[PDB]
Amino acid sequence: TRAYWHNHRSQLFCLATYAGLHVLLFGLAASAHRDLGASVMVAKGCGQCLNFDCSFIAVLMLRRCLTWLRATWLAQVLPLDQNIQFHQLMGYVVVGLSLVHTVAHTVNFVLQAQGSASPTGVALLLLLLLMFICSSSCIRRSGHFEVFYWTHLSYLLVWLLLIFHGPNFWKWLLVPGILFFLEKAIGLAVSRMAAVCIMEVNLLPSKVTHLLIKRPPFFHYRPGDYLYLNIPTIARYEWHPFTISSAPEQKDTIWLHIRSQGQWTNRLYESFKACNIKCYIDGPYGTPTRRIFASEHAVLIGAGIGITPFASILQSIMYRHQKRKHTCPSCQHSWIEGVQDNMKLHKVDFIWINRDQRSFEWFVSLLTKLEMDQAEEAQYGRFLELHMYMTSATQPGRPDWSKVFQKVAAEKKGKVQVFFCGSPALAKVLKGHCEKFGFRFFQENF
Amino acid sequence: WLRWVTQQFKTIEISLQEFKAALHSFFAERFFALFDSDRSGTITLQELQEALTLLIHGSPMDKLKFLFQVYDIDDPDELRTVLQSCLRESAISLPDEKLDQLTLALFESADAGAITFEELRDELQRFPGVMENLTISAAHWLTRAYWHNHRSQLFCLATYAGLHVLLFGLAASAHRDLGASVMVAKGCGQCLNFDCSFIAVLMLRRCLTWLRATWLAQVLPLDQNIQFHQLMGYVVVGLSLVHTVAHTVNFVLQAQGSASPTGVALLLLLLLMFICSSSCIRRSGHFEVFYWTHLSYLLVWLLLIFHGPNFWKWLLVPGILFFLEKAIGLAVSRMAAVCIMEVNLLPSKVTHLLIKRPPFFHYRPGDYLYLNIPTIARYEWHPFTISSAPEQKDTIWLHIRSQGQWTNRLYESFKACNIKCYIDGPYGTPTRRIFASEHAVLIGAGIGITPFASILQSIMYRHQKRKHTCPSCQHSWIEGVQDNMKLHKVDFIWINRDQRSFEWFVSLLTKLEMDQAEEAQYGRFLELHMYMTSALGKNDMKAIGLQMALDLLANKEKKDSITGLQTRTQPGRPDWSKVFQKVAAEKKGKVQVFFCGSPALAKVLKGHCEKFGFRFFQENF
Numbered sequence A: 001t002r003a004y005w006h007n008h009r010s011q012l013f014c015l016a017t018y019a020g021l022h023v024l025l026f027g028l029a030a031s032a033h034r035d036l037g038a039s040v041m042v043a044k045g046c047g048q049c050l051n052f053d054c055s056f057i058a059v060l061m062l063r064r065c066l067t068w069l070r071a072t073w074l075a076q077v078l079p080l081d082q083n084i085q086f087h088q089l090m091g092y093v094v095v096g097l098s099l100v101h102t103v104a105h106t107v108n109f110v111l112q113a114q115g116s117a118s119p120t121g122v123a124l125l126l127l128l129l130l131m132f133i134c135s136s137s138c139i140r141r142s143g144h145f146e147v148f149y150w151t152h153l154s155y156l157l158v159w160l161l162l163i164f165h166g167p168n169f170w171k172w173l174l175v176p177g178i179l180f181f182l183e184k185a186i187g188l189a190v191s192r193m194a195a196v197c198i199m200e201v202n203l204l205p206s207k208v209t210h211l212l213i214k215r216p217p218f219f220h221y222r223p224g225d226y227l228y229l230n231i232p233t234i235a236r237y238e239w240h241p242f243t244i245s246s247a248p249e250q251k252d253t254i255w256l257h258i259r260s261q262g263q264w265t266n267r268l269y270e271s272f273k274a275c276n277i278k279c280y281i282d283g284p285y286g287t288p289t290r291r292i293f294a295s296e297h298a299v300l301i302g303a304g305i306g307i308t309p310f311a312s313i314l315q316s317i318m319y320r321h322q323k324r325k326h327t328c329p330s331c332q333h334s335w336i337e338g339v340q341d342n343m344k345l346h347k348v349d350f351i352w353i354n355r356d357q358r359s360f361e362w363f364v365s366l367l368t369k370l371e372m373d374q375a376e377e378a379q380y381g382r383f384l385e386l387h388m389y390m391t392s393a394t395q396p397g398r399p400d401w402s403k404v405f406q407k408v409a410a411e412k413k414g415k416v417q418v419f420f421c422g423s424p425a426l427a428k429v430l431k432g433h434c435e436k437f438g439f440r441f442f443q444e445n446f
Numbered sequence B: 001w002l003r004w005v006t007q008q009f010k011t012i013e014i015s016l017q018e019f020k021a022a023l024h025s026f027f028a029e030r031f032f033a034l035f036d037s038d039r040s041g042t043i044t045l046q047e048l049q050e051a052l053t054l055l056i057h058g059s060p061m062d063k064l065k066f067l068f069q070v071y072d073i074d075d076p077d078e079l080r081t082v083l084q085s086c087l088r089e090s091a092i093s094l095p096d097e098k099l100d101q102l103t104l105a106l107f108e109s110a111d112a113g114a115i116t117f118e119e120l121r122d123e124l125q126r127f128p129g130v131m132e133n134l135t136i137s138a139a140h141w142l143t144r145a146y147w148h149n150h151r152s153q154l155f156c157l158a159t160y161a162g163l164h165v166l167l168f169g170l171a172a173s174a175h176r177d178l179g180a181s182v183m184v185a186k187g188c189g190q191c192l193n194f195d196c197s198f199i200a201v202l203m204l205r206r207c208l209t210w211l212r213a214t215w216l217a218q219v220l221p222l223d224q225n226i227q228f229h230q231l232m233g234y235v236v237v238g239l240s241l242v243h244t245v246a247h248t249v250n251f252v253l254q255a256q257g258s259a260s261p262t263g264v265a266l267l268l269l270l271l272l273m274f275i276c277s278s279s280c281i282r283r284s285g286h287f288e289v290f291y292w293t294h295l296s297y298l299l300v301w302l303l304l305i306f307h308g309p310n311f312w313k314w315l316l317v318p319g320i321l322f323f324l325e326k327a328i329g330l331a332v333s334r335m336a337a338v339c340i341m342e343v344n345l346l347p348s349k350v351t352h353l354l355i356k357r358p359p360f361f362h363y364r365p366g367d368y369l370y371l372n373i374p375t376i377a378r379y380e381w382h383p384f385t386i387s388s389a390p391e392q393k394d395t396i397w398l399h400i401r402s403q404g405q406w407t408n409r410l411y412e413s414f415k416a417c418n419i420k421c422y423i424d425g426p427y428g429t430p431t432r433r434i435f436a437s438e439h440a441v442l443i444g445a446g447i448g449i450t451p452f453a454s455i456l457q458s459i460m461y462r463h464q465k466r467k468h469t470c471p472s473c474q475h476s477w478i479e480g481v482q483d484n485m486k487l488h489k490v491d492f493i494w495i496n497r498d499q500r501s502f503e504w505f506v507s508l509l510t511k512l513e514m515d516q517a518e519e520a521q522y523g524r525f526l527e528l529h530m531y532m533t534s535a536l537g538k539n540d541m542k543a544i545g546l547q548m549a550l551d552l553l554a555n556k557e558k559k560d561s562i563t564g565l566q567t568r569t570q571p572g573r574p575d576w577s578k579v580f581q582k583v584a585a586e587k588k589g590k591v592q593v594f595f596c597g598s599p600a601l602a603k604v605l606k607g608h609c610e611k612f613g614f615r616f617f618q619e620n621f
């Protein structure tokens, strides 16, 4: 659709520039070997393309530097949450190109039939087929992940073999390769790790587990800071990110809501379907959101399914709001302090738009809780308003942004803002509606 | 002891001149007069022996009689003169009315018309232990030291010299066949390829900050990068000189195209930079002229590309790193066209900027910033520590001390507002570990105590923002914790030679302490200790007499006259045993020490913390 193109705009640009660079290198090597007949030309071309891919696959799968890029607007412009299913694509392309390359050189060696390169080539083809065989989803689907890791560790020996197999290859391999080695060196046992222990585990409906891990003493995170969880019982060497779904004012534990959407998280749900186990979290990462707490009548709008950090944001807002309701220990006169200047809000909206509540029952329960929490406080003033839409049947059907925005602009609470977390098809609509009413728009990357 | 006395006497007849020279002042004159018992002006061996026996081996009554004889210049006028001489020796800069009131109080509390010697002893009896502890400061008579601090800089200098002798030998061995000329020429060629390449990667004003926060700042020096860079420049000039003379001797031996033209060009360019980048160009010149002339590093690198055939191999990494960082820094990268709200000139040539806090400017307590002023130096960017707590929402302070050519020129110019300045936002190590503790002991030794001002002001702001008062009953009560500061007490121990440029810090701590001293009746939350070690120690008889009036003035006013502080200022170095014992005596939580100073005290404090079980820290700033 038109909005499919608008959302996938930043994906199609990257895919097309990749295909363009491939055809550029292919044609460059084609021209430089036009003299040879139809077999070493395509072979040299595919060789150049393989150099490029077999080099940059690693930097495509760079873990630590990718997080640092996710914080800036760079995450806004190009999609850097897709690195895994761009990595699998570049792997498939390496396999296809290496296969056609072997076919080209074997046809050439047959035509010439009418060392260091060829044996190393056979071994390289065998290893690439090993990785492409023991790295497909059928290997992690069944509950063996360490087999996958051990087989797919052979990229090291593939790089070794390829160093003294392609003449100009080490030039390509060096910079991404040295970046990869640097990042694997920075990441050591307990560099930013912590051997925290699960204090409890719940199993909410819709196959979502609700980890209550034990808070590490010196672990301080802003609301919305995701962590990279690791559970040896499930998979020893996998590190899947997860968004902390508990307001930082939680001093005892750290929640994590882990929705079943794959092979690791499914393994987690099924395993605990049978608590104190080992976990190794890796720090708080994510965008700092002080623009919300330093605002008035913020309008948090979360669409799609990237709204787990809004649970943390809303719980932190309501905690810091309850933390300004004083009562005299003698007169019992309860008076409400004005702004604390660490949170400057006078109202909040929350418009969660989705297609259903398939996986988010914990979210709906938490929002009813935070709405009933101040429901008796609504006698003088309502702080948190909840607008939840479903668009498939709670006000069913898509909203009317003119209507809800005019309802916002109806009463005067201050400088109305917007914060958004969703599909860029809707982000520009919100930017247009937003500067129409003088609402200072913002957009969040999570 | 007779041998030491004879040696000391032989070391100087010993007239009053050599006496004052060995003793290192009107007190010195009185001592020279009272030492020669025969009033002969020269100190014989017998007179010096008797003086030493009466001072060291003499009883406290003998020392008291000697002090009384030295004090009676013939009363209040003599006491005032002696106290003035002592303060001149003690660097105690007090007002004339302050000294008058001190002399009056001393004459009131000591004279029971004239200070009687019996009355003098009866009053000195109030001084506990000072009787036996009475000892003249002149008797004080009876390198790896700075390497202990330089154990990290000398590491860098040594590895640098090693990585030069390595390249020199590597190039000399490969070309030993050439006779005595091209060997050193090619050695210097390689050393130049290294220095002219890395001298700029030393100047990373952006990546160093990221490295300044890490423990790499603890292991190797990251503040003295400018001096290491100047040193590498000096050795580039020296090496270029020997390299040109090597090639010219080679040429004249052979005579007995890129080489010669680009050689002359690089030689002249490096000489131009070495001339227009000395101290004199900025002491009495335009910082802009310095910047423009010494911008020629681009031209030097360029002409070096097609002069050293394999030089670009070196220049690849540092050149691209330098240009990457320079491109990251753009006109609105993180700059902010901040407007000075107002400036002051606090004493000791320190200027005090109040720059208007940008609306979207959030800094932790103790974050520095790279201030620039297009009026002082158009292009230089100097770092400075925010000396205003974050909870202060109106303006950002900056306490800038004249310690060079930029800051000094700033002070001079303002000595003659709404100007433009381009700060570079917050930096620095995180400081939340100071707030998440109990009875933290912030110790600031040396000249790194500007962020402790910010931290103390933020701590007191939060403390005052956890004191409540009901609008109805007016019942005032306190809270337990605010979840952003869990402290229960703070001890600020501040060692320095003198109050030279920190009287603003003094006037700030006075404010903090007295702002809650009237609440210390039920609980004291911040304890201020201030040590000016250069002041005369409480063991010196003159210093004993001076304290014998300072203490009375304190009891009269309840304010230590030196600073108006509620606490008293303790001259001399601290006995960390007693300090940590007093810390451990009371129980306010898990003690945590913090520190910012020279490693010489870092090791002492780490040893004592292991002795007393306190989790010593040392923040990097």
Ligand SMILES: Cc1cc2nc3c(=O)[nH]c(=O)nc-3n(C[C@H](O)[C@H](O)[C@H](O)COP(=O)(O)OP(=O)(O)OC[C@H]3O[C@@H](n4cnc5c(N)ncnc54)[C@H](O)[C@@H]3O)c2cc1C
Binding pocket: A081, A082, A084, A085, A226, A239, A240, A241, A242, A243, A244, A257, A258, A259, A260, A261, A262, A263, A264, A265, A266, A308
């Ligand atoms: C910052 C962030 C926070 C997230 N928080 C949550 C959360 O709280 N709850 C939740 O249910 N999901 C969350 N996800 C998405 C995802 O479900 C988990 O991150 C995790 O990747 C699931 O692993 P999986 O076994 O299902 O992956 P697979 O089933 O093996 O892979 C299928 C999908 O998972 C993605 N994926 C696989 N490995 C990774 C990886 N290492 N990093 C990122 N994506 C990966 C693939 O791109 C694809 O979309 C988050 C993603 C990100 C980027």
Ligand SMILES: Cc1cc2nc3c(=O)[nH]c(=O)nc-3n(C[C@H](O)[C@H](O)[C@H](O)COP(=O)(O)OP(=O)(O)OC[C@H]3O[C@@H](n4cnc5c(N)ncnc54)[C@H](O)[C@@H]3O)c2cc1C
Binding pocket: B223, B224, B226, B227, B368, B381, B382, B383, B384, B385, B386, B399, B400, B401, B402, B403, B404, B405, B406, B407, B408, B450
């Ligand atoms: C994080 C930090 C915070 C500081 N805060 C203060 C403060 O609040 N008040 C204060 O009086 N001083 C402070 N200084 C020290 C110093 O006075 C200033 O940093 C300032 O840069 C000195 O300028 P100058 O022109 O006098 O130096 P110059 O006269 O130009 O140089 C002489 C000395 O200054 C150093 N220096 C010169 N240029 C720089 C530069 N760009 N960056 C760092 N050092 C340089 C040299 O290494 C040498 O030690 C701080 C230093 C650092 C590293």
Ligand SMILES: NC(=O)C1=CN([C@@H]2O[C@H](COP(=O)(O)OP(=O)(O)OC[C@H]3O[C@@H](n4cnc5c(N)ncnc54)[C@H](OP(=O)(O)O)[C@@H]3O)[C@@H](O)[C@H]2O)C=CC1
Binding pocket: A007, A008, A009, A010, A011, A078, A079, A303, A304, A305, A353, A354, A355, A390, A391, A392, A398, A399, A422, A423, A424, A425, A426, A429
């Ligand atoms: N960098 C990128 O390229 C990014 C891409 N994405 C894209 O996000 C998509 C997520 O799938 P999905 O979440 O289904 O798509 P959406 O993100 O469009 O669904 C989000 C919600 O917005 C609602 N919505 C869309 N337009 C309007 C409107 N005009 N008025 C009111 N409500 C509206 C939809 O309702 P209904 O479902 O009823 O239409 C849906 O429930 C992925 O396909 C991915 O490609 C995500 C992030 C960034």
Ligand SMILES: NC(=O)C1=CN([C@@H]2O[C@H](COP(=O)(O)OP(=O)(O)OC[C@H]3O[C@@H](n4cnc5c(N)ncnc54)[C@H](OP(=O)(O)O)[C@@H]3O)[C@@H](O)[C@H]2O)C=CC1
Binding pocket: B149, B150, B151, B152, B153, B445, B446, B447, B495, B496, B497, B533, B534, B573, B574, B597, B598, B599, B600, B601, B604
């Ligand atoms: N990593 C490094 O190499 C660093 C080095 N420095 C050092 O900072 C120094 C600055 O001069 P300065 O700050 O005077 O050097 P110091 O830090 O040694 O002097 C600072 C204060 O510490 C006091 N002091 C020193 N040793 C003791 C002790 N054993 N017991 C009690 N008090 C003590 C001094 O008292 P008194 O003056 O009375 O002796 C002085 O008041 C430079 O010489 C430099 O070497 C600075 C930063 C880091």
Ligand code: HEB
Binding pocket: A054, A055, A057, A058, A061, A087, A088, A090, A091, A092, A094, A095, A128, A131, A132, A133, A135, A136, A155, A158, A238, A239
């Ligand atoms: C270069 C070479 C190479 C190649 C060819 C490849 C190829 C591939 N691949 Fe690879 N990978 C790689 C190299 C590679 N690769 C690396 C290096 C990585 C990273 C890992 C780590 O870090 O450990 C990866 C990673 C990876 C991953 C991740 C895991 C997680 O989750 O953690 C995946 C899934 C993949 C898949 C794949 C596929 C499917 C393919 C096709 C065959 N991979």
Ligand code: HEB
Binding pocket: A044, A047, A048, A050, A051, A054, A098, A099, A101, A102, A105, A106, A117, A118, A121, A122, A123, A124, A125, A128, A162, A165, A166, A167, A168, A169
């Ligand atoms: C990785 C993937 C891969 C694979 C599998 C392969 C496989 C192969 N191969 Fe190769 N190659 C390659 C990649 C490859 N490859 C490269 C990259 C190169 C380089 C390119 C250029 O040219 O640059 C080559 C190159 C090459 C050559 C050329 C030589 C040189 O060194 O120069 C030849 C002959 C070949 C053959 C071959 C064969 C026969 C095979 C199978 C057995 N290869």
Ligand code: HEB
Binding pocket: B196, B199, B200, B203, B226, B229, B230, B232, B233, B234, B236, B237, B273, B274, B277, B278, B296, B297, B298, B300, B301, B380, B381
């Ligand atoms: C060519 C190369 C080079 C050389 C040889 C040099 C050499 C030198 N240098 Fe230099 N620098 C440089 C390159 C250089 N350089 C750079 C690149 C820089 C940085 C700048 C910027 O960043 O802008 C500097 C920077 C610099 C500075 C800084 C400024 C401020 O304060 O901020 C100074 C002072 C200097 C000095 C010097 C000296 C004294 C010498 C000796 C002559 N230095």
Ligand code: HEB
Binding pocket: B186, B188, B189, B190, B192, B193, B240, B243, B244, B247, B248, B258, B259, B260, B262, B263, B264, B265, B266, B267, B268, B270, B304, B307, B308, B309, B310, B311
């Ligand atoms: C800047 C500093 C510098 C300077 C000034 C110079 C200056 C000079 N120089 Fe010199 N070089 C150099 C640095 C230099 N340089 C280098 C670095 C090189 C290279 C070395 C290698 O091996 O790398 C050379 C090189 C050179 C050579 C060899 C060959 C080529 O490379 O082409 C020669 C012959 C020369 C000469 C010379 C002369 C004659 C002069 C003066 C005029 N050198």
Ligand SMILES: CCCCCCCCCCCC
Binding pocket: A011, A014, A015, A059, A060, A066, A079, A080, A081, A082, A083, A085, A086, A089
């Ligand atoms: C099939 C989807 C392709 C998406 C391409 C994403 C590119 C991510 C680049 C990440 C660089 C670190």
Ligand SMILES: [Zn+2]
Binding pocket: A328, A329, A330, A331, A332, A333, B470, B471, B472, B473, B474, B475
């Ligand atoms: Zn009351």
